[PDB]
Nucleic acid binder design. Structure first.
Ligand SMILES: [Mg+2]
Ligand SMILES: [Mg+2]
Lengths: 1208, 115, 114
DNA sequence: TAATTTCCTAAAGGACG
DNA sequence: CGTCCTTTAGGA
RNA sequence: AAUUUCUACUAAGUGUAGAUGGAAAUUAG
């Protein structure tokens, strides 16, 4: 058997097919003359308004009831989290206290003030009339009468606010875990520096403007958490933190602003308080965007006043303290150090030098774990002072002058691009096009918005966390009061890109009702009389049928007869949630009709003693079992319809097993006959709207392979579909408006030779025998229908998948591995490997080879993406041009997925995907981060029900029997080291490693000084020119060298084999041995003495060791590309293998299936695959009980030892 | 009068422009997409005699698809790829790149560009 | 007041009629030879707004091969076949097949004639 | 934009005409 | 007494 | 350059090859 043979039928799934509804006959005219269209359209246009009024009343309710809450268990929990719990089995009673707190807050909500007259029908009929005094407002709520039950979706989106499930969408988890945690944190931060803040500078105003009683100090203290739970209390909390308004434009200082004011020492490095959480521009027209633009971003605006205030403030920049400027470390310092000096991370290099002096000893080898800890601590250390930039600068350079000058020159750039563009800023500017299509105006807003947004990003580093201690002050006052005014232009930027990238279509729609709040409940037998929605099958062409309101029983008295026309009809209702359904039907005034007062069963249901809270008793649970099993046995609505072939008395050792059995058996859809002429007459008379469900595989012309969704909708009524794929209810109906107006369509003409846009399409020009339009489907008022299907509602093979893959793979002897990775010349490079490490196939995915009918026509994507990026280069507006690259990439990742799902069943493998939580990659690779994260979400949710269309539906792999070889995707941070078959692996030391040796360049070979270079040379062992191999052998020991802790052999023989590629940006190819001969004879050293380390530590000029360090680094590159030509790249090894020949990629690109990787990218995929092969080797070492806890996140030294032990 | 027929010869030059546009539209369709010439686009009609090429209100991008409207047969043009929604009614073939417009490309230059 | 402006209108109508025949030439080439309609060929610009249908001087036969000139871009038209060698540059379709000219063929009725 | 929920229901209760 | 909404009930 | 919808198209003529889970609410950026 296979491994994927076992992985079937694991768990449940909810997919929404959707389809287009074609009106058949005069039914569209029936909707028109019956005056049925505008009714839902006006109903779906005040539904938001009555929902807003209802949320207004609900906020009134919460404002009423939060002023009467009292959490009595606060007094102990404020101590017990201030215990430093150390677990020791003490935190679980701590969690019981917390669940008591989040329960006891709900008791005021769910207990009192009605609360059944809060979500029932009574609210919009009685209370919201009283809760409103304007006639127009009551006119809205008096319209939805009779249609109250439509809000059951909204009410079920309301009742999650009041629950206790530790979901974020409660109020309980808000006011405990998002409120008390920050409360006690800010309380402890308040209690540490409480003696900092005095009376006569902040307290004398905050005692009277905020509260005028209980002034300040009790707030963080203890028992004032029971006030901050409301919106006005957290508003006072924010006014303490952010600063009050006092109804005027003074905007006086707050307490966190007083820690931004306590700056008179100039040594900050201490945290502030934190704000708290609380629950419950364009895009209208073109001239409104123009109004917003030239009225909120003219030079007359306050934002430009903030700019001029910043200009005069930075005119006074050097007249303050040169130590009171903190700048926040992060992504910013790499550009900060590059704009002051011109080098990338020399301030990081200066701090790294200083921390090398502080914490590392006087020994000549850095620990690589100390390097990783130094990286994580440099990311941990908050900010650096401007005096620390004075000490990191050399002599004759104070750093404040360059910041002042470049800031003034950048706002001068803003000034100059404003003055060159003031021709638009006349407020009576008249447009000429739609700005979606216009280009001359969009570029101006672009170049101004980019200047002001780039300066905003240029000054976003200059905060240092904001809530910091001692610093400089009077710079920072005008700084923050100009920055708060400035920052709204970026929200304007995000708004205008949400207008220039508007859709040409319109996906506005609304919910169809047909005068029925019970519209489209579910597919059923008897409830056709209420939901008024039945599916009719004819030939292979389907129909939905809606009758009307006042003829609601027109689908009853229809028979077979044989008039040579007979639509079929689908029936056999479900049984939704029998664990809640059978008590709903069996104790609800039905017990008296069928039974009497036994009572014994009534008491054990009354205790709930068949659930947990008691284990069970074989009388206690099984009295329920036979009571249900025999009360069903006389129910005439179901017992004739369903065969309840049940298991015996001893199989049901719980209650969930029988409930799962009736969940399995309760859905038996089949055909009912209804002849054609009378139902067509019923359509003709106007009693039955008959739509046709349609997609582009239902037509007679569609002879290709159908859509996967159409395959599901065909399989829904197969005779092989037993209970696997059920067509559950909850379907809806939506109509989109025709938006491409008929004076605005474009259309290719008929019988005209139209050209082909695919370059590899061998037929070069096509003729069409009729008309084809552009986006015709938006030019028609079109109905669309959504049906929810439920796939695998009752599974059998139930187990945890992450354990199962491991216990399967341990028993496996040759597990294949597919590894995917990113790159530059290729977007994704597939490798696939065996259990030994032997490569079995590899290729690039720049071309996707679509195949049909035995003919395969390859589709390049990289040259297409090059065309679109070449358009973005000469784009002149860069907003319609950069969104389409993003959508093309999310139109490209949707075709690699079929190749991956083909390869998985082809090779029984697992997949190894490059992680993106723990790596800062090269920022030059093509498929960037927001596309790769989108890719992994589209490989998990396809592997959830993996199905290949061209297979037998009955067999395994088919659409009745998809493999479910992963779990559900959760979140972009919850993707950690295992999910199904998808392994996440980090991508460290993965590109720059030869696959025949396992060698790595690990040194730090750029020049700083002569004696350090001589230290480097004396750390070498042998530097002797071998004459018959005509190279220079470099025997070195990694124990001699710094930061080389991670290696395994630590004894390598480097060489000058082959040529390299120097950057110089220019391009420079250099052959290495001749370059070394030139550098030696340029400086005159006889280099035939074998070891000559003493000879190389005798030169005393900088111009040699600056020139030798570059060549020594360029010996070890193995990443030799031009990035101007896709064909010219190679990865080459400076190390002999176990035989003694080297590895050149040029020897292996021109081979059928090379036993080494072909290109520099295939090396990356192959080394991702080797880590999963090491994990396979790890899986056999442990045992079947510990296999669920094997650590996979492989540290570097283990990986290097695996890599060097690979070739033996 | 001297400002009346010059309110009329302006209607003669549009009859010239539309013939130039239709003559262009029958030759762009006959090209592969990597051989499409850079054009200058606008929605006002553009005279290929003068053009006032120094005007800063016009760029020089490639031409994508050549299509036709629905009710009339007026040949709109797509600049760049399809999904840009850049519909335009008047193009003039040039040889200059995006902002430095060198000269106006002539008809036989486009005709020979097919090869 | 009518001295040189006649030459202006004389040119404007020629630009109009050449716009019309260059609207027509592509639809002409996209027709099969058994559907090639009947023309009022003149090698003289004959205004499609009136058609001047009183004169029976114009012969009415079936149009043949639609070649392009090599010197200019002009739509040269042949009547019958190549074997007649009748090189004409101005045609308008009607339903006036043999010599009996009744009604005008407009553009949507030569497009739908395909 | 991303995280996080609820639903993916037939049948009793009843208001009313 | 249909008819037409409202509410409803909680497996491991 | 057609589409339930997106993406590439024309792929042999009203289409092809892949994918697609919707409706609503709330929070944070
Ligand atoms: Mg298909
Ligand atoms: Mg498209």
């Amino acid at each position: 058997m296979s491994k994927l043979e076992k992985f079937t039928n694991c768990y449940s799934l909810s997919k929404t097919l959707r389809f287009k509804a074609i009106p058949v006959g005069k039914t569209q005219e029936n909707i028109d003359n019956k005056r049925l269209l505008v009714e839902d359209e006006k109903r779906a246009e005040d539904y938001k308004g009555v929902k807003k009024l209802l949320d207004r009343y609900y906020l009134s309710f919460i404002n009423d009831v939060l002023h009467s809450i009292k959490l009595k268990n606060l007094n102990n929990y404020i101590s017990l989290f201030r215990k430093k719990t150390r677990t020791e089995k003490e935190n679980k009673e701590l969690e019981n206290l917390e669940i008591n707190l989040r329960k006891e807050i709900a008791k005021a909500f769910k207990g009192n003030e009605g609360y059944k007259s809060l979500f029932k029908k009574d609210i919009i009929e009685t209370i919201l009339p009283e809760f409103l005094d304007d006639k127009d407002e009551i006119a809205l709520v008096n319209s939805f009468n009779g249609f109250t039950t439509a809000f059951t979706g909204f009410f079920d989106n309301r009742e999650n606010m009041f629950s206790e499930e530790a979901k974020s969408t409660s109020i309980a988890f808000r006011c405990i875990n998002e409120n008390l945690t920050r409360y006690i944190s800010n309380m402890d931060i308040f209690e540490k520096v409480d003696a900092i803040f005095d009376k006569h500078e902040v307290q004398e105003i905050k005692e009277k403007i905020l509260n005028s009683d209980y002034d300040v100090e009790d707030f963080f203290e203890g028992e004032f958490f029971n006030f901050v739970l409301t919106q006005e209390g957290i508003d006072v909390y924010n006014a303490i933190i952010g600063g009050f308004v006092t109804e005027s434009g003074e905007k006086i200082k707050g307490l966190n602003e007083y820690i931004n004011l306590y700056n008179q020492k100039t040594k900050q490095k201490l945290p502030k308080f934190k704000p708290l959480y609380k629950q419950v521009e364009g895009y209208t027209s073109d001239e409104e965007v123009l109004e917003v633009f030239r009225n909120t971003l003219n030079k007359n605006s306050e934002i430009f006043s903030s700019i001029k205030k910043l200009e005069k403030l930075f005119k006074n920049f050097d007249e303050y303290s040169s130590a009171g400027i903190f700048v926040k470390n992060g992504p910013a310092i790499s550009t900060i150090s590059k704009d002051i000096f011109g080098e990338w991370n020399v301030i990081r290099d200066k701090w790294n030098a200083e921390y090398d002096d502080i914490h590392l000893k006087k020994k000549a080898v850095v620990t690589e774990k100390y390097e990783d800890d130094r990286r994580k601590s440099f990311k941990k250390i908050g900010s650096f002072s401007l005096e620390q930039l004075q000490e990191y600068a050399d002599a004759d350079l104070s750093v404040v002058e360059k910041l002042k000058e470049i800031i003034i020159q950048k706002v001068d750039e803003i000034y100059k691009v404003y003055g060159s563009s003031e021709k638009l800023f006349d407020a009576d500017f008249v447009l000429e096009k739609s700005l979606k299509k216009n280009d001359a105006v969009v570029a101006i807003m672009k170049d101004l918005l980019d200047s002001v947004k780039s300066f905003e990003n240029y000054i976003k580093a200059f905060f240092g966390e904001g809530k910091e201690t001692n610093r400089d002050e009077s710079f920072y006052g005008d700084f923050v009061l100009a920055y708060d005014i400035l920052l709204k232009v970026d929200h304007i930027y995000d708004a205008i890109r949400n207008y220039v990238t508007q859709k040409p279509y319109s996906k506005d729609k609304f919910k169809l009702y047909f005068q029925n709040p019970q519209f489209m409940g579910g597919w059923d037998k008897d409830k056709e009389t209420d939901y008024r929605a039945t599916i009719l099958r004819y030939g292979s062409k389907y129909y939905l049928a809606i009758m009307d309101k006042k003829y609601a029983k027109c689908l009853q008295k229809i028979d077979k007869d044989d008039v040579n026309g007979n639509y079929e009809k689908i029936n056999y209702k479900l049984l939704p949630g029998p664990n809640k359904m059978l008590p709903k039907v069996f104790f609800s005034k039905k017990w008296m009709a069928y039974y009497n007062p036994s009572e014994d069963i009534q008491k054990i249901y009354k205790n709930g003693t068949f659930k947990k809270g008691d284990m069970f008793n074989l009388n206690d649970c099984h009295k329920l079992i036979d009571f249900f099993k025999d009360s069903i046995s006389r129910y005439p609505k179901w017992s004739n319809a369903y065969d309840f072939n049940f298991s015996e008395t001893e199989k049901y050792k719980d209650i969930a097993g029988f409930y799962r059995e009736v969940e399995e058996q309760g859905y038996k859809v089949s055909f009912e006959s209804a002849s054609k002429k009378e139902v067509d007459k019923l359509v003709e008379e106007g009693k039955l709207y008959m739509f046709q469900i349609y997609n582009k595989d239902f037509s007679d012309k569609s002879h290709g392979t159908p859509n996967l969704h159409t395959m599901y909708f065909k399989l829904l009524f197969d005779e092989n579909n037993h209970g696997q794929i059920r067509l559950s209810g909850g379907a809806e109906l939506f109509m989109r408006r025709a938006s491409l107006k008929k004076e605005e369509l474009v259309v290719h003409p008929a019988n005209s030779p139209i050209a082909n846009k695919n370059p590899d399409n061998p037929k070069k020009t096509t003729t069409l025998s009729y008309d084809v339009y552009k986006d015709k489907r938006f030019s028609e008022d079109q109905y669309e229908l959504h049906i929810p299907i439920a796939i695998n509602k009752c599974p059998k093979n139930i187990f945890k998948i992450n354990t199962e893959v491991r216990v399967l793979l341990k028993h496996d002897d040759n597990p294949y591995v597919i590894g995917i990775d990113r790159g530059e010349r290729n977007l994704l490079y597939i490798v696939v490997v065996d259990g030994k490490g032997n490569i079995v196939e590899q290729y690039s995915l720049n071309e996707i080879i679509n195949n049909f009918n035995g003919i395969r026509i390859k589709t390049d994507y990289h040259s297409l993406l090059d065309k679109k990026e070449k358009e973005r280069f000469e784009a002149r507006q860069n907003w319609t041009s950069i969104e389409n690259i993003k959508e093309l990439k999310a139109g490209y990742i949707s075709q690699v997925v079929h190749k991956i799902c083909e390869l998985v069943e082809k090779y029984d493998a697992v997949i190894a995907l490059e992680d993106l939580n723990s790596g800062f990659k090269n920022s030059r690779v093509k498929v960037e981060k927001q596309v790769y994260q989108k890719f992994e979400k589209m490989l998990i949710d396809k592997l959830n029900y993996m199905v290949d269309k061209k297979s037998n539906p009955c067999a395994t792999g088919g659409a009745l029997k998809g493999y479910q070889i992963t779990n559900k995707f959760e979140s972009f941070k919850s993707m950690s080291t295992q999910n199904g078959f998808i392994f996440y692996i980090p991508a460290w030391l993965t590109s720059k490693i030869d696959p025949s040796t396992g060698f790595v360049n690990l040194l730090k070979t750029k020049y700083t000084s002569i004696a350090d270079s001589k230290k480097f040379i004396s750390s070498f062992d042998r530097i002797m020119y071998v004459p018959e191999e005509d190279l220079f052998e470099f025997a070195l020991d990694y124990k001699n060298f710094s930061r080389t802790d991670a290696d395994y052999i630590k004894k390598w023989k480097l060489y000058s084999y082959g040529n390299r590629i120097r950057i110089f940006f220019d391009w420079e190819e250099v052959c290495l041995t001749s370059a070394y001969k030139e550098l030696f004879n340029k400086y005159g050293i006889n280099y035939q003495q074998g070891d000559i380390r003493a000879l190389l530590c005798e030169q005393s000029d900088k111009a040699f060791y600056s020139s030798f360090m570059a060549l020594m680094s360029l010996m070890l590159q193995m990443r030799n590309s031009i990035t101007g030509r896709t064909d010219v790249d190679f990865l080459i090894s400076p190390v002999k293998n176990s035989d003694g020949i080297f590895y050149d990629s040029r020897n292996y690109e021109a081979q059928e299936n090379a036993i080494l990787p072909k290109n520099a990218d295939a090396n990356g995929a192959y080394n991702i695959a080797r880590k999963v092969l090491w994990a396979i080797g790890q899986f056999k070492k442990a045992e079947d009980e510990k296999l669920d806890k094997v650590k996979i996140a492989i540290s570097n030294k283990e990986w290097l030892e695996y890599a060097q032990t690979s070739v033996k | 009068m001297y400002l009346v027929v010059q309110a009329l010869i302006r209607a003669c030059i549009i009859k010239e422009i539309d013939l130039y546009t239709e003559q262009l539209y029958n030759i762009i369709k006959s090209l592969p997409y990597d051989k499409r010439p850079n054009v200058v686009y606008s929605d006002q009609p553009l005279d290929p005699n003068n053009l006032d090429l120094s005007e800063p209100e016009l760029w020089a991008e490639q031409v994508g698809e050549c299509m036709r409207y629905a009710h009339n047969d007026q040949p709109c043009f797509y600049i760049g790829s399809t999904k840009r929604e850049l519909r335009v009614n008047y193009i003039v073939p040039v040889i200059g790149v995006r902002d430095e417009i060198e000269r106006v490309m002539t008809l036989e230059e486009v005709r020979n560009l097919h090869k």
